[PDB]
Design a protein around this ligand. Structure first.
Ligand SMILES: [Fe+2]
Length: 401
């Protein structure tokens, strides 16, 4: 059912009142999903897999979350439908056999919605004021966390880790208004907003964890940052500065080389190539060094294998990845939940996975935004603090109440 832009989408989402819904932007389309026809839910410590459809609830064996995810995609209530997904930070720990302190958000949900609205401008097919935020607060404690990471790195425990900070927000956030105002101020590779079981998140994702089309897998590490928060002369001065800063270039190439190794774990030998090498990517309040790496999936590997290797983005966790994940759980004192996780859209053509950064989250107990910086041996705490505030300025100025 057919009909003959972002305001309209935003208003539609307000009429979705308290209902569960999923918004995903992948240009040229905006995807809106409402309700729940089938869902796989993995709880926060990965001890229970619950499947729900109209017929009932089931518990599924959860020895392998990836295997539950495969089971869901091949289910008869699911096959051939678009699936909207979220993957919490701690999915990595669980998949890798690394002890972790469980947060409160699920490790993984996949949902087939009951109703869908697809905007392919300026049409749509149907299927069936701002909160002031002080991003400097608690910076001294954060610079201490960075100093700890730098010392651990220089002792040789690991090479890179993303240390992040949560900013608690004073009041709850109007999701559709924030979506509208926040998006016009950003140029993300994806946008998302999801509401589910009392939890909400929205954000403007700066990079893909992963995209798979047929047999081709692509990942898009971004690493290395300057502001683009001044006039155009200041911005292009910052662009040049970024392309020639040896610390940012080094951070970038170390991440790209780990993305390559990761893909070689799941791809045909000799198929892994860098298609775009360290170009600047504009992302609202910041601009980033970005590369694109691609390969051909081996015969015995599927998109979930690739996602398990690629998740979380190197550029959100660290190098080597497992040691970085351990450092993150020792250093950070609040659960990341969905921050540095992934948003998924899965359909006929594609497995699509966006990194959850530049995002806001709220549930029954917490309401917060979150940002991190990639710490290497050369890092300076003051600079990394400032960098988090540059990233937070991608979302904080546009949190509507
Ligand atoms: Fe950085």
């Amino acid at each position: 059912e057919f009909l003959h832009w972002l305001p309209t989408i935003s208003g539609v989402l307000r009429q979705f009142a308290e209902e569960e819904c999923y918004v995903y932007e992948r240009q040229p389309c905006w995807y809106l999903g409402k309700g729940c026809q089938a869902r796989l839910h993995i709880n926060a410590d990965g001890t229970q897999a619950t499947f729900i459809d109209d017929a009932g609830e089931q518990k599924w064996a959860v020895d392998s979350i990836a295997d539950c995810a495969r089971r869901f995609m091949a289910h008869p209530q699911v096959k051939g439908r678009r699936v909207y997904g979220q993957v919490g930070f701690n999915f990595a720990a669980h998949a890798r056999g690394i002890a972790f302190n469980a947060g409160e958000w699920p490790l993984l949900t996949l949902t087939v919605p009951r109703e869908e609205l697809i905007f392919e401008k300026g049409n749509v097919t149907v299927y069936a004021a701002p909160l002031a935020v002080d991003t400097a607060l608690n910076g001294e404690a954060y610079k201490q966390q960075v100093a700890r990471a730098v010392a651990e790195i220089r002792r040789g425990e690991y090479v890179k880790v993303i240390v992040s900070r949560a900013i608690p927000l004073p009041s709850r956030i109007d999701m559709p208004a924030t979506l509208l105002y926040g998006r016009q101020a950003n140029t993300p590779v994806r946008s998302f907003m999801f509401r589910q079981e009392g939890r909400e998140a929205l954000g403007f994702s700066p990079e893909l964890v992963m995209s798979v089309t047929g047999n081709k897998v692509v990942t898009e590490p971004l690493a290395g940052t300057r502001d683009r928060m001044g006039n155009p002369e200041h911005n292009k001065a910052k662009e040049a500065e970024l392309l020639h800063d040896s610390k940012e270039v080094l951070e970038h190439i170390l991440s790209v080389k780990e993305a390559i190794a990761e893909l070689e774990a799941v791809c045909l030998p000799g198929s892994v190539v860098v298609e775009d090498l360290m170009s600047v990517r504009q992302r609202g309040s910041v601009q980033h060094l970005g590369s694109g790496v691609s390969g051909q999936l081996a015969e015995n590997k599927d998109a979930w294998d690739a996602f398990t290797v690629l998740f979380p983005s190197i550029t959100a966790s660290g190098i080597p990845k497992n040691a970085a994940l351990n450092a993150i759980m020792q250093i950070e004192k609040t659960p990341r939940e969905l921050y540095s996780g992934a948003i998924l859209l899965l359909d006929d053509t594609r497995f699509d996975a966006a990194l959850v950064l530049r995002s806001v989250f709220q549930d029954s107990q917490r309401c917060w935004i979150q940002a991190g910086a990639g710490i290497i041996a050369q890092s300076t705490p003051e600079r990394e603090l400032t960098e988090t505030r540059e990233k937070l300025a991608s979302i904080a100025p546009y949190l509507m109440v």
